[PDB]
Paper text:
Tryptophan indole lyase (TIL, EC 4.1.99.1) is a pyridoxal-5′-phosphate (PLP)-dependent enzyme that catalyzes the reversible cleavage of L-tryptophan to indole and ammonium pyruvate (eq 1). The reaction mechanism of TIL is of interest since it catalyzes the β-elimination of a carbon–carbon bond with a formally poor leaving group, indole. The functional assembly of TIL, and the asymmetric unit, is a homotetramer. The active site is formed in a dimer at the interface of two monomers.
Hence, to obtain a structure of an aminoacrylate intermediate, we have now soaked TIL crystals with 50 mM l-Trp and 100 mM BZI. In this structure, only chain A is in a fully closed conformation. This chain contains a PLP complex that does not retain density for the side chain of l-Trp, so it was fit as the PLP-aminoacrylate complex. Above the β-carbon of the aminoacrylate, but not connected by electron density, is additional electron density that fits to the BZI occupying the putative indole product site. N-1 of the BZI is hydrogen-bonded to OD1 and OD2 of Asp-133 (2.9 and 3.1 Å, respectively) and OD2 is hydrogen-bonded to NE2 of His-458 (3.2 Å). In addition, N-3 of BZI is hydrogen-bonded to the OH of Tyr-72* (3.0 Å). Since the ligand carboxylate is not in plane, this density was fit as the external aldimine of PLP and l-Trp. Chain C is also in an open conformation, but there is clear electron density between NZ of Lys-266 and the C4′ of the PLP, and with N of the bound l-Trp. Thus, this complex was refined as the gem-diamine complex of l-Trp and PLP.
Numbering used by the authors:
A (entry chain D): 2 to 398, 405 to 465
B (entry chain C): 2 to 398, 406 to 466
C (entry chain A): 2 to 397, 405 to 466
D (entry chain B): 2 to 466
């Protein structure tokens, strides 16, 4: 494995502590064996998400301090509008309080727009892979969320350059099956979070957009990790090995009509989101009319002015190639420590997380005994590291658990490679009691979203 | 008019300027004669709103700096849960990114809950007066927003202690006509924003909650300005003459089942909101399930951790009687400066804004040609002060019974010398009020036109 | 009296409170009847000094957050050097932790430079008026500190444009009596703090610099309140009535060879100082050699990088005429309030404080019993406002020409409503002035006794 | 070499950049081959000092935001006074703007105090090793700065537990040859910076104080790195194996009557200093009277209230053993990476810096041609790392001959700021110096282009021969 040095130095620290196993195990009892219900006081290193836990720069805090809190016409709204025009070449912006706020703004509008003239009677969204909140909004609006990720993503340990690509064959089949008139939009998720943070190639984005444009289908770029996608295109696509990251981004967004962004990811923020529309004024007007009751007035969108100011700065810092190389290299370093030790991962590692594959380390625990969770709980009891499950405890009602992933999600510019080593050694050291591991059962199961609030028991 | 001194001193300043007349003339023309389209660079004193423009304390900023940004289990979530138990005696909280996000969490849930066993077939919400976003969410969910403020609120110059009271006669009348099966919730707005920021008496809240409980009707306390309501209760109710502000609050929330709070008002914040439920754990569970797709995870709700930390501190600071006395007295001071110059206003002044009747200043302008807005634009050209129009321009395509101008005062931002500037600007126009002309449309959108309609003189 | 409105609004507040009369009585006895020994918690409105108590801007705080803390070559050192070149046309800077650090850097250097050829055996410094730390460093280096302010400064109620001027005839008399070879330097203090913050005219500074040059005498501009002095030159000198503040400043510094500056005054800071030298590289090198053991390395001088960063921004904001108009106008407003009620003050009021002439307020108490200090302690017990003595106590018994109580006004901290509290407090003691007693030492330090001396009433 | 994980995570970052090889070649020439004259923009990793460059915590910044800026009686002065009582059991405090301001407050007062009754006719100060600013203030007040560090410190490759100890034999001899009337004070420097950030044992501190106490000699603990000293005492003195760091500190200061502190070191600050005095109220009153002209009023002492607020919190954080273990272990890691590559260093590594013995690195460069500076300049040109010399360039010219003052060592100091750099930054530093091993032989000495008379190392210009 290769350690890559920080292209920065530390200016402010935040204390963290590992609770004693007596404290650590008592906290898991009261938590009901669900890490989502643990308080942060009980977590050493927190790998639950890369969302909103990033470390900002001094320039970002300086922007927050001079942020314009005006209810209408904030200086930072116009800055954010100019920045989206610079990065994506899109003429219209609506800030949102975070990613799913942006989805709430835009997806109901696209459905209403598609259902003009009385079409879209069987409305669907098609994505390489809809993220959970994205799919939830698709379905809350009475549509179907169709995921057509490339089959390469399903062969975890076999390298491929672009495991986030659309299955182009399935895109055409679905357009034929449902009809272009029922397809509300195509959602291109970059990077493809649910496939393991795996990149979508520039030629896949291009071909998907050209196919959709030919059928008059609107394309939204789910852009939470668009900079981590742009880096992979520069690193794996020869046509772009000599291009700046901003050049890769500018081309990427020729292949979408709008974007929804969680700025809690690649823009390096702790809160914030964005809608941006290339040139459809009518959809922009309609989305603004939804923004007002759901989020806020159209020039802050549920954000403080200081957070729009931090977004303007964080959008620039997140395109910097030397940071991205360090960021994605640190993720790759953790993955290499793991697979050099014989732990299966989605290879290659994505931009933001290491995905530990199905539990070939706990064979005695089946699907509905939650094998990834028992790993996570022993991993938590042995080290204090909170990870998130992507398996039979997330999927729910039992829909076939094709993968028993464990996601080690890494916040940006927060943890060092020595933190990565601690993570790796903890998980490797679980090859002592991996076999002698008890399964878990529902002591309290909620009707929906159980992985958030279900109380389990060994 | 009596000045009351700040119970604080200034620790940090934000510099503001008066644009030159040429610049103000040019800016307003660029804005199409609609101050909601003005950038903040075009405004000197901004009285558009009291929402999110408040000045925070050093303790609030310090609380933000140590804020826990954890995705799940943030330490500040538990502090906020405790604070809401302390202030209101409510056992459950769901943070929200701001007030209309709190409404979007709670209100659809209250309807679904009422629809059990085929009730709520013609559902309605009843309020002393529903705010704009409050009624919008009621209407968005297929319900009717019914306002039954006391008739005393319509007699603008006649003093009354409680111009935000429920009309009890209309409350039982509406329960009789619609049936308790159709009343999803009663919403107690404290203070009553649309009545001029006018207080609701403790007895009015008590009788309303008694009537709603005898019919099994859920009661939501819209709590954006609950501290100004608590101050007015202590000032004007002999029963609470020697009670602390927190003791007045604690009694207030014995007369509701839940609250929706915009923390951007009285809790002295730039962003933030809150749902709190007294003891109904089923409604709490259901609201959490709506929180996840719409706002975020249930322990941050679309807020940064630093803002939950700022909210915990602001909730305390907003209850301090000496601050409330100064804040509400500053609003009173501006209102007294205007009355003493013969300007009609809603009397007495409410807790956060002065409301001017423009039908008397510009009688030569009918309501359909926006007399109040023509005063606001003249006020702007002469002063750079930005007000907000409550009248035919806000009402929409509709005969408005009043052409108001709201001078909304942010908390701890402007001095009484700023109040003097505002008063003197409006007064100085006394002889030009009759020589100025109304506005017509250059551009008008279909809904909520007051944000983006471009007007033109005649 | 004319209230002038803030050219800014409040962005952050700080709690202050009024201690009870019991608290005040115990605190003053505990402090040895010396308000300098009072804790800040025992003070309501603190008028002890205008030094380091100023409210910074959000831009100043933003500068601190990106401040460069490097030990050598901080980015903000070079920014400060450029700013000094811009404002004063001076080519050399040495930062200092505050004003008396700057004096400790430069004065001993000037003493040894002057006597490098076996002359200056009876070394003296000449000033319109050395402030106390200035005179202390003069005497601490074995020199005499001569003060020759205009006789106009001693006639309190009689207006004059330039009550800080040098007495040019005394300057000539002192040069002849002591000889140019014994005059280490002329210090031009602007504004003249000890005369009441009273301005020096451009033609006075010019005539002093020309007299010094023909005799070969080095001139140091004590620059703590140089921007206030510039404002008065533009206010009262028809030659400069239509110049900018920065043009006035530029012309001022053609009439010195170097400056010492407490940046805790006009540059709007809480800490910081500065030495700047026009073009004498030898004295610059000698001053740097002393800076290293006394203050720090020459590119930070005992300041954090963030404080140099704040100083670059504050040097700009401190020159803004709209700011200076408000600041000096607030001082004038408190003075006019007291003058209208018959309280004798130094008229016209200076830039930073109102100086109450206690020689007339309490004529029964002779100067050796500190009449102004008896009024100050009475003002504190009566109201919790803490002021400072600029008379016999501070002079270190040396005969005093002025017995002042100084109401010193911090920049951008208190409102005119705080000023009304101060004025009404002092006005309300009009009948108790005669019934006041002198004070007597119980512990007297040898150097600058007034800071730590313990006193007892008579 | 063992890497040790941070007992914290990162909350705020500051960008850094590697100037291109040519940028470093131009900048070092503009700086006259003296890195002290390079701007911070010319530097990648800055190892010039560990003073004032530390990374603060969120609690520290929060404390600054609520800091009381009052001129007299700031709430944070009383907090700082209580913290010094809790930590050291000392009853009196005087803030200073930083450590050499604390020295300027107290050392002239100490000489004046001893001078009563005609004593101190030929005054001296005795220390294990006076630091540069400390000796300058001693000498500025007309005293001689005597340094009696244990001879073990000169044997850089030979390990010892307490290379910062006083030499007790030389201490008694110096009390004999000068007389207790001429010893203004003994200055215990913890850790001993000049000796390599090397700890002083508790029994060495105790014996020195007992010797001085029976002879009427005031003892000042130079306390810039007292927490790092305390960690080493717990780490190497079996007596305190079971003690907390605060208990070790509390014992250390039974063996002094006052302290002077640069809070820009172990209290994790960017600015700040402190005089604290155990019980001598007369010394405290005199030091207060000097504080007023030189630093400021006695309740802020030349510090903004926010910095006193940050000091109270940083004083606490700097005592936390889990932080000290990581901090000192990071320094040890850099040293071990260098030792494993055959690079000679002061062994064991001290608390705050790795000291590289440059006499053995560049034999072809004599002491007058600045061997340590030549290594430092090559290290900068090769990697953009800025280090500092503790050798013949800092020493200067002998006042009695006008030629090079012969140095008994020739260190390059890799000074590590607290909580700023990661162990991957340490690898960059080590690899940079290792990668010059074959190039050391072809390194050339340095020659003056501009030389000032005093303190030439801060501002002199040089050129290669
Ligand atoms: C907040 N009301 C604020 C802000 C606001 C919102 N819509 C407005 C239209 C016109 C003028 C001001 C407007 C106000 O200034 O009145 C509020 C809410 C909604 O909270 P949120 O703005 O944080 O989402 C709900 N209920 C009441 C009583 C409010 O005052
Ligand atoms: C033991 C000791 N005492 C006193 C001081 C003086 O404190 P301050 O600098 O706050 O006034 C220092 C400073 N030592 C720093 C700073 C320093 C001074 N001179 C230097 C020469 C070269 C490199 C650094 C420094 C160091 O890096 O060792 C010190 O190490
Ligand atoms: C919540 C995270 N993801 C959010 C996300 C979202 C939702 O963004 P918010 O969490 O900011 O609502 C949308 N689209 C994609 C591809 C996403 O990854 C997460 O990784 O935990
Ligand atoms: C402290 C103030 N004066 C300081 C001062 C000083 C000393 O600056 P410092 O307080 O920053 O040392 C020097 N010169 C002049 C003309 C001054 O007015 C004061 O007026 O309270
Ligand atoms: C994993 C972790 C956090 C999430 N928040 C919303 N969806 C998620 C998936
Ligand atoms: C009066 C008040 C404060 C002072 N600081 C320095 N000199 C002073 C005189
Ligand atoms: K967050
Ligand atoms: K806001
Ligand atoms: K201060
Ligand atoms: K520093």
């Amino acid at each position: 494995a290769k350690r890559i040095v920080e292209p920065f130095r530390i200016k402010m620290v935040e204390k963290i502590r590992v609770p004693s196993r007596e404290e650590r195990e008592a906290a898991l009892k009261e938590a009901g064996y669900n890490p989502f219900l643990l308080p942060s006081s009980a977590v050493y290193i927190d790998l639950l998400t890369d969302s909103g836990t990033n470390a900002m720069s001094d320039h970002q805090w300086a922007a927050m301090i001079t942020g314009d809190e005006a209810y209408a016409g904030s200086r930072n709204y116009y800055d954010l509008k100019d920045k989206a025009k610079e990065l994506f070449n899109y003429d219209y912006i609506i800030p949102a309080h975070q990613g799913r706020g942006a989805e709430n703004i835009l997806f109901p509008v696209l459905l209403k727009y598609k259902q003009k003239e009385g079409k879209a009677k069987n409305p669907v969204f098609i994505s390489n892979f809809h993220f959970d909140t994205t799919a939830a909004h698709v379905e809350l609006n009475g549509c179907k969320a169709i995921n057509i990720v490339t089959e390469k993503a399903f062969d975890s340990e076999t390298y491929d350059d672009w495991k986030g690509d659309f299955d182009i064959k399935k895109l055409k089949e679905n357009i034929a099956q449902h009809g272009a008139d029922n397809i509300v939009a195509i959602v291109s998720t970059v990077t493809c979070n649910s496939a393991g943070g795996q990149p979508v190639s520039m030629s896949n984005l291009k071909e998907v957009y050209e196919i959709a444009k030919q059928h008059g289908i609107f394309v939204v770029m789910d852009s939470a990790r668009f900079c981590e996608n742009a880096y992979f295109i520069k690193a794996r696509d020869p046509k772009y090995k000599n291009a700046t990251i901003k050049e890769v981004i500018f081309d990427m967004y020729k292949y979408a009509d709008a974007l929804t962004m969680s700025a809690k990811k690649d823009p390096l923020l702790n809160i914030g989101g964005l809608v941006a529309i290339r040139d459809n004024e009518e959809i922009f007007t309609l989305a603004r009319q939804r923004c007002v009751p759901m989020e806020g007035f159209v020039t802050y969108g549920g954000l403080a002015g200081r957070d729009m100011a931090a977004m303007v700065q964080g959008l620039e810092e997140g395109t910097e190639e030397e940071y991205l190389h360090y960021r994605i290299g640190q993720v790759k370093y953790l993955g290499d420590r793991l697979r050099e030790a014989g732990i299966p991962i989605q290879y290659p590692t994505g931009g933001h997380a290491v995905f530990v594959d199905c539990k070939k380390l706990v064979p005695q625990i089946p699907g509905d005994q939650f094998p990834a969770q028992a790993v996570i709980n022993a991993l938590y009891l042995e080290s204090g590291v909170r990870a998130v499950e992507i398996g039979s405890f997330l999927l729910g009602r039992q829909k076939h658990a094709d993968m028993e992933f464990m996601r080690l999600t890494i916040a940006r510019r927060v943890y060092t490679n020595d933190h990565m080593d601690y993570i790796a050694d903890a998980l490797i050291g679980l090859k002592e009691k991996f076999a002698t591991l008890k399964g878990l059962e529902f002591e309290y199961e909620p009707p929906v979203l159980r992985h958030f609030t279900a109380r389990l028991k060994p």
